[PDB]
Amino acid sequence: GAQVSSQNYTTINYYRDSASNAASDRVLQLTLGNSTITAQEAANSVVAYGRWPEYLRDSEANPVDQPTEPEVAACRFYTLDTVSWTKESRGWWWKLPDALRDMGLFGQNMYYHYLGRSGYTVHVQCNASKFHQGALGVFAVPEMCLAGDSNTTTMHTSYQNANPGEKGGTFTGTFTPDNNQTSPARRFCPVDYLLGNGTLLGNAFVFPHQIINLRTNNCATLVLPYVNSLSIDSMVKHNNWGIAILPLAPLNFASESSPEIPITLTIAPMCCEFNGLRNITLPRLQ
Amino acid sequence: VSWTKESRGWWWKLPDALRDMGLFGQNMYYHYLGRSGYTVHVQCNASKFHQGALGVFAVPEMCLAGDS
Amino acid sequence: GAQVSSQNYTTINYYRDSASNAASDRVLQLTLGNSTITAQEAANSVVAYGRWPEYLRDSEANPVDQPTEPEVAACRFYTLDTVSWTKESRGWWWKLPDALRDMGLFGQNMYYHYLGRSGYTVHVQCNASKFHQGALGVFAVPEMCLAGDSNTTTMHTSYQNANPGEKGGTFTGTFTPDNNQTSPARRFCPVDYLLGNGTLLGNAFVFPHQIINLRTNNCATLVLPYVNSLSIDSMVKHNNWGIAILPLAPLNFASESSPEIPITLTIAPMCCEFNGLRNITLPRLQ
Amino acid sequence: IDDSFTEGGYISVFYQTRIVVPLSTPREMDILGFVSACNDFSVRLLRDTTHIEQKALA
Amino acid sequence: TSRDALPNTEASGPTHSKEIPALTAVETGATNPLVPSDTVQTRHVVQHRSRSESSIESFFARGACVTIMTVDNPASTTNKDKLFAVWKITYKDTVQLRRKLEFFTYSRFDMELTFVVTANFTETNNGHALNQVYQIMYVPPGAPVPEKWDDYTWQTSSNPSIFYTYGTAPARISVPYVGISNAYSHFYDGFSKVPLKDQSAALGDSLYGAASLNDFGILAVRVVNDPNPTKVTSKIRVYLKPKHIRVWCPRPPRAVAYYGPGVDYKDGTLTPLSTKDLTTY
Amino acid sequence: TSRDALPNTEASGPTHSKEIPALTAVETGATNPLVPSDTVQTRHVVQHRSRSESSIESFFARGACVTIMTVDNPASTTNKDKLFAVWKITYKDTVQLRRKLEFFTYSRFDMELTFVVTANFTETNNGHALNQVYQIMYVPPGAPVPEKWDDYTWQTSSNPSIFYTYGTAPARISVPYVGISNAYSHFYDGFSKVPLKDQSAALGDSLYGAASLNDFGILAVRVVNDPNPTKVTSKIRVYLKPKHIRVWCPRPPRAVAYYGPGVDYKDGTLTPLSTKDLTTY
Ligand SMILES: CCO/N=C/c1ccc(OCC[C@@H](C)CCN2CCN(c3ccncc3)C2=O)cc1
Ligand SMILES: CCO/N=C/c1ccc(OCC[C@@H](C)CCN2CCN(c3ccncc3)C2=O)cc1
Ligand SMILES: N[C@@H](CCC(=O)N[C@@H](CS)C(=O)NCC(=O)O)C(=O)O
Ligand SMILES: N[C@@H](CCC(=O)N[C@@H](CS)C(=O)NCC(=O)O)C(=O)O
């Protein structure tokens, strides 16, 4: 029993284990549940990795009990807070599913079960006039890990500072190490041009992304499937996605020295399901 | 509840008694309309040397009289 | 000449020796000979390992001479002594075929021949009232070896102390080492929670067993086939089975401080046969 | 082993109602517990145990 | 085969019936064969796991150390006798393989023995030595046992032997099932003699649990070289692998420290369990 | 297959049309798939080059050093304890393979480990030593860890081991994919505990990005020989080759020096780019 291939040559497997073997576009409308969105200046939309969200199949299900699928009660658009873009802004970040932990019945289902999974639709809104200039880069990062603020210890960020919620965090232009040994702050110090994790910002376009250019469009839409090394996981311990918004070109208006415009985010869970019902979790978030 | 020789009886309202029960109460208080049926199971055990009898009744539109 | 298998891979044997190769229920009635048993509160019965006793087949017979099969003369129920279960009891044990060495013609055939084999039916009887509580575990152990009472020597138990007969022995709650160097006792010291052999009692349910729960049943029945590494053996040197009875829950009655109830054992040989007739053996049993 | 990322959960026993007996009966009793696996249970990565040790040879 | 996947889980909905699978009776002596579908609502799952690694063949497919033997080649300028090692074959000098095997009452298996040899100098003297060769001889019961390191018994006209050169691959051999019964007996509840009333007390005495079923001979090991001016000490580790193994009559595993070759236990070692409150997680 | 040649170039002449392939919009998030034929006049070229050497299998088909372990056999005339080495399995003690792997978020692969052993004398004394043998034992999580160089744990009844004779070919073994997830996680954005308001602050604390998904046991290495009058120091280099590898979710590569096992960076190392004038070639 020998295998003949071309380079011809012959190979034989000696062991029983394979390990041993030698090797139009501007217009958009979205409807989820009882919520709708319209857009008249869009740059199309992005589906991350070309994969649409879907439910978990029988041939890939780890847990054995019957899952819960709220559907319209939780698969709907939630609007977070609105941030202000000025000439001194460096960028903002959010974690998913951390930013929806207090959003109607989605948060209740999240905190009542032990396992959960879901995809997302993210819609970023920012409008200005024909006399404004600027550009924003919106990136979706799987496993968005940020660096700490300590040069004497590593991986010492507290659970509270890493989960800000719907308010999110911001990037900074400089790295400031914390020197309080008695009362360490235990928080991230993400630098903008390093993307907060030691890699150059210019390469962040490897991740799913879009660009809002004030002279072209005023909104961005990203469709994120569920990504993880497991079929289903704990939503309260682990964040699946991170959203990062950074000014690629600074904001400017006519000759004013202090222009400002708002930026709003709307996120919708998709195909979300849960397992392992028990008493509700009461985390220490302060 | 505790059944003694001075007891006169107890009553409950449905869906009022499940208003703080897991996700059922959350769904009840988040929506404007709802409907449901029920399964009720009453448990009471004693010995072969006890005697007594309980009547359990389910009343639709159980309206009670006031104290005035 | 090569063997092709799947993992495909190929294997060849180089040597001529394979060693070199790389790798209703409550009611019961029993009738044996001229003896019968009836039971009205039973928990069914247990057949050890799912095998019924049988005679030795031609394709497995070591000795060449004609065997003896007494049948009804020896395959019958014999009642041993009755023990008393109180609140201070720790348990009792018996050895088979040692406990039937003085039982009618079975003992005579046992002591007149050189080889013998047999299975057994064991029936334990214990009844109380509806106001008693308690539980007994009955276990049948193949090769039931017990530990000695000496910490200066091992395997020093005398032949007389290891074969008590139909009276049997008892377990103890504590280990007491013997310190008489001049006149060693040479007897077992079996501890109950170690099952007398250094293994935890909770796991004894790996062996064939039953439980007598005073509120459920009042009798237990175990059917034991012949088990050994030989087809036939010497019954006077080697014991095949051991019966162990232990209180899983202590006996209690109303408010009395000293309740007591009897426990009786009845054992029947099955499919017994013998080989090697000679003059009778006269052991030193005292 | 004891691990936070693969913890299993909790098990408990409660009184639904109380225990009721008549007169002339023991007022205290015992219960026993057993554990076993189902038909979909499996293990892997054979290793060594900490439940046996030695100090001197033979 | 053992690599066959386990059964799939089946979807089950709400139920309302008289049959009660949960309640049972353990007094019978059987185990309730419940599945998760009998107590909770479940979904359909396609199963992929298998029990291939817990089979009897896999559970014993490792080489375990059974003994360490010691030999030496002494200095030429001394009067010490040359040392050769004798070992009685058994798996009870160690605890790990013994505990693994004593999960069961009877077993049959072929054996595979591997020998690992190491050597060292004993004195600071810069003296040297040439590469050594070792003779390992199997002496079955009843054969003559060597008494000197160079007597006639080492001619091995009928005893099998291995000659091993130091620094090469560890030695290896294989053995079949060589018992006089139909299976190996891990436990034996009996004696080898029956005392008789006519005979004296001492003429019937024997040890409890000892039988000639477990007599397999000895291994004798010597250095074949003649002594050098400097002493060299060598140790040989023996590793046993059972293959083609079959077992019968499972038993509970050992819970306390072993004490001798029997089931005896020693005072002061009978507390295997630690503390834990009843209502504490 | 990866050895398939790339597409041929096509001849193109002058053009005059309304369609504009050059102008585009990068705000959408896509890349313009232009070829040279869309902007200049080209000739016909038969292509011969292929992308066989940039595949995922080829990019990882080398053995990379992951650790160097140290053992010694001390002098017989001293009181020093014999040294044995313990190493926790990981690819993050070095930077080259770590940077190559962290181009992606998830991966599956079988592993191939090679061991290269070297030894030397420590003292000028002319003392000598006989050839040494090394035991390398894999201890999975939850198994007993050795504490002395010659305690019972080295009997290896169930732990796999390698016995290596010095001066022979370097040792080698192969391992399958042995993760408890469906793929290896190079990054983990989470914790292992969730703190609770009722419980104390210290009872919920845990490290950021640490999970038991990345616990694979340890390797323990010892010299099996007994000490000689002279000390001998040995070092073992471990080389890891991943094979049958699959990857998911590409990421930008590391641009600054690594600092610990996380994504943290150290002050004074955040200037990876050099100077260059805007209008200078
Ligand atoms: C020169 C090299 O040649 N070696 C040949 C050889 C041949 C036969 C050998 O005997 C093998 C005997 C073992 C298969 C016995 C192992 N077992 C089986 C059960 N058992 C045991 C011991 C003590 N109490 C109970 C069981 C054991 O020790 C050894 C070496
Ligand atoms: C005696 C010789 O036998 N050796 C056997 C053996 C068996 C299993 C072994 O474990 C292999 C574990 C590796 C496949 C793990 C490599 N990876 C996968 C991802 N990962 C990692 C570590 C830290 N953070 C993220 C990922 C790793 O370190 C090692 C040796
Ligand atoms: N004792 C003898 C040497 C031993 C010897 O020559 N033995 C012979 C005959 S007893 C033998 O058979 N040796 C076996 C062997 O060593 O291979 C002497 O004084 O040198
Ligand atoms: N410490 C013992 C030597 C070590 C020893 O003999 N260990 C035995 C029992 S603890 C063992 O299992 N060794 C394992 C091995 O080194 O292969 C001595 O005083 O010589």
Instruction: Return the HEC string of B26-37.
Output: HHHHHCCCCCCC
Task: Provide the resolution (angstroms).
Answer: 2.8
Closest CA to C144 of C91, C72, C77: C91
CB-hemisphere CA count at 13 Å for E182? 11
Alpha helices in B1-68 (DSSP H): 22-30
Alpha-carbon span A229 to F177, nearest angstrom: 14
| DSSP annotation string for chain E | -TTSBPPPB--B-----S--SS---GGGS------GGGTS-B--B----B-GGGSHHHHT-S-EEEEEEEEEE--TTS-PPPB-EEEE--S-SSSHHHHHHTTEEEEEEEEEEEEEEEEEE-SSS----PPPEEEEEEE-TTSPPPSSTTSGGGG-SSS-EEEEETTSPPEEEEE----SSSSEES---B-S---BSSS-TTTS---TT--GGG---EEEEEE-SPPPSS-EEEEEEEEEEEEEEEEEEE-PPP-S---TTSS---TT---------TT--
| Cα separations in angstroms, C19 against C58, E112, E137 | 28, 9, 20
Strands A132-142, A241-253: pairing kind: antiparallel
Q: Are F and C neighbours with ≥3 CB pairs closer than 8 A?
A: no
C124 close to C267: Cβ distance less than 8 angstroms: no
Strands F171-175, F104-121: pairing kind: antiparallel
What SS3 state is found at A268? strand
Put simply, the answer to whether A143 touches F250 (Cβ < 8 Å) is no
Alpha-carbon span C236 to C110, nearest angstrom: 8
State the ligand closest to the CA atom of E209.
1
| DSSP annotation string for A67-90 | PB--GGGTSS-EEEEEEEE-TT--
What distance in angstroms lies between residue E11's CA and the mean position of ligand 3's atoms? 80
| Cα separations in angstroms, A60 against A110, C242, F38, F63, F249 | 21, 50, 46, 34, 20
C-alpha dihedral sign at A210, A212, A215, A219: positive
DSSP F54: G
Closest CA to A157 of D6, F105, F267, F263: F263
Q: Which two tokens stand for residue E251?
A: 């038993």
Alpha-carbon span A170 to D35, nearest angstrom: 52
DSSP F175: E
Cis peptide before C97 (omega within 30 of 0): yes
Helices A104-112 and B22-30 cross at an angle (nearest 10°) of 180
What SS3 state is found at F212? helix
What distance in angstroms lies between residue E128's CA and the mean position of ligand 3's atoms? 25
Q: Does ligand 3 lie within 6 Å of residue E155's CB atom?
A: yes
| DSSP annotation string for A101-121 | TTSHHHHHHHHHEEEEEEEEE
> Burial code of A77-94, b = ≥16 C-beta within 10 A, e = fewer?
bbebeebebeeebebbbb
Q: Does ligand 2 lie within 6 Å of residue F218's CB atom?
A: no
Put simply, the answer to whether A143 touches F187 (Cβ < 8 Å) is yes
Q: Is D58 on the interface with B (CB under 8 A)?
A: no
Alpha-carbon span F169 to B49, nearest angstrom: 86
Closest CB to B49 among D16, D17, D22: D22
Q: What angle do CA C211, C212, C216 make, to 5 degrees?
A: 115
Helix (H) or strand (E) holding F57, with range, is helix F56-59
What distance in Å separates residue E63's CA from the closest CA in chain F? Answer: 6
Residues preceding chain discontinuities in chain F with C to N over 2.5 Å = none
Helix (H) or strand (E) holding F98, with range, is helix F96-101
Q: Which two tokens stand for residue E243?
A: 């293959």
Alpha-carbon span A28 to A51, nearest angstrom: 20
What distance in angstroms lies between residue E214's CA and the mean position of ligand 1's atoms? 8
Q: Look-up: residue for tokens 């479940």?
A: E42
What SS3 state is found at F169? coil
State the ligand closest to the CA atom of F164.
2
Helix (H) or strand (E) holding F97, with range, is helix F96-101
A47 close to A221: Cβ distance less than 8 angstroms: no
What technique solved it?
Answer: cryo-EM
The chains found to touch D (3+ Cβ pairs under 8 angstroms) are B, C, E, F
Radius of gyration (C-alpha) of chain F in whole angstroms: 28
Q: Which two tokens stand for residue E144?
A: 């003559």
